[PDB]
Design a protein around this ligand. Sequence first.
Ligand SMILES: O=S(=O)(c1ccccc1)N(CC(F)(F)F)c1ccc(C(O)(C(F)(F)F)C(F)(F)F)cc1
Ligand SMILES: O=S(=O)(c1ccccc1)N(CC(F)(F)F)c1ccc(C(O)(C(F)(F)F)C(F)(F)F)cc1
Lengths: 238, 232
Amino acid sequence: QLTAAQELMIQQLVAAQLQCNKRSFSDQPKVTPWPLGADPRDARQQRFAHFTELAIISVQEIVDFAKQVPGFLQLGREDQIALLKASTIEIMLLETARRYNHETECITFLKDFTYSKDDFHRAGLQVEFINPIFEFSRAMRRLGLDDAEYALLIAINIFSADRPNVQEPGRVEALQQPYVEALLSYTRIKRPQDQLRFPRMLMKLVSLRTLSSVHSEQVFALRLQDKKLPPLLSEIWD
Amino acid sequence: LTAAQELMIQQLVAAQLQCNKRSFSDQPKVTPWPRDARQQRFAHFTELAIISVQEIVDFAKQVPGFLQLGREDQIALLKASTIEIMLLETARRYNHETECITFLKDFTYSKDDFHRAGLQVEFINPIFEFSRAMRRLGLDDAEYALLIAINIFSADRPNVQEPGRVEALQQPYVEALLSYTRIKRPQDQLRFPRMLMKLVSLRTLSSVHSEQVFALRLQDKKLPPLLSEIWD
Ligand SMILES: O=S(=O)(c1ccccc1)N(CC(F)(F)F)c1ccc(C(O)(C(F)(F)F)C(F)(F)F)cc1
Ligand SMILES: O=S(=O)(c1ccccc1)N(CC(F)(F)F)c1ccc(C(O)(C(F)(F)F)C(F)(F)F)cc1
């Protein structure tokens, strides 16, 4: 059985997740609306802007989230910054997968709005990034994670000691381990008869690293098409 | 551990052992380790890298499931794996007492020797941090071999046409490792998670390696043909 500490650390995470997601419902109508009624280059830019604008919202939700993960604020500020520079896209990819719906083959963001493979392509993104996103999301759906599992995976993802420019990786590892132990024990209990579900979970952190590279390749490729990231996204990903 | 599991693991270990005997019994054919010797130490590094690539390809071929994928997937999985397997293998060859990487008698390389070959700081330190991490895990020959098998059958590499078939090939090796680590160290449950987590590390490490290649090109230091096929 889960310990009280372990249950609390899941409940802490799931609840922080919810308070950070109020940024999503408030800032939903503020955004550049997705262009209805468009011909064949005006609309291509608006969709792109729209996608950046949701990304910004997510970056700020991930900042706010991390600040509430116990231990995070007590890491040196440079390591905090370094963990969030690296884990941000990956948390976004988890959140994208978490909102994937296999009936419609569409991803949900900010409560209501949904996107297809083709919306992503209508925003000027290339197939080399879009296809892995949807395979990841499909893969993540075959694992059937609940909120607790996703939460724990995001916490583990933040506390990755081997990110670039971490100056006290040891302190990061010490914060990561309890969350990994928690997930181990959680998966055991939920699914006693599936000894491979936990490993498959950790293996998604492997996929997330490569997907992080593919995203950098995508932002690289986007500047050749007059599409430079806005200021808050430039400082994380250029 | 089932008969079929003992068979799979014995095979991987026996192939690693033969690969090593084959590739690294005799003295390597290499530019003698000495602007003159900037290119010479690099070339040297490049020629060791090639011999490891050959060793790894020889081993991949003997991993059950591999030679039964479509040729394009065989190429795709090796292309992405090669540097990662090299990093595992380097960690295997690491000697913490001495801080060097020993291919065979008299072919050892220190953090300095790397720097002399033209290699950035940005690449070398991750290499050595990763290696002394792997040692603290204390993997044995069956574990290293299985990790390598698992790394090869990563369904999410670029250009993989049959990701479902690759993931099904991974499964039994993950299973064999899980069983194996359960038995070897019954009262160390995080051992296995820790091993998988190094696969994460290797992905980031591969990208740090691509940055080293692109950086070298800037100093007119281009990969030779056998390595260029794979990395640029
Ligand atoms: O969660 S995301 O912000 C998202 C944006 C729009 C619609 C749905 C979801 N995210 C999707 C991902 F799968 F990658 F996680 C996403 C993040 C960043 C990007 C970009 O960096 C940019 F510019 F839009 F901000 C880029 F398009 F360049 F790839 C695109 C999508
Ligand atoms: O095992 S390696 O082949 C090796 C080469 C020389 C001396 C010791 C070990 N390998 C080491 C690593 F840790 F990175 F895996 C290695 C692989 C690739 C490289 C390079 O690609 C090149 F050109 F030298 F081959 C580069 F230096 F550019 F990174 C260097 C070393």
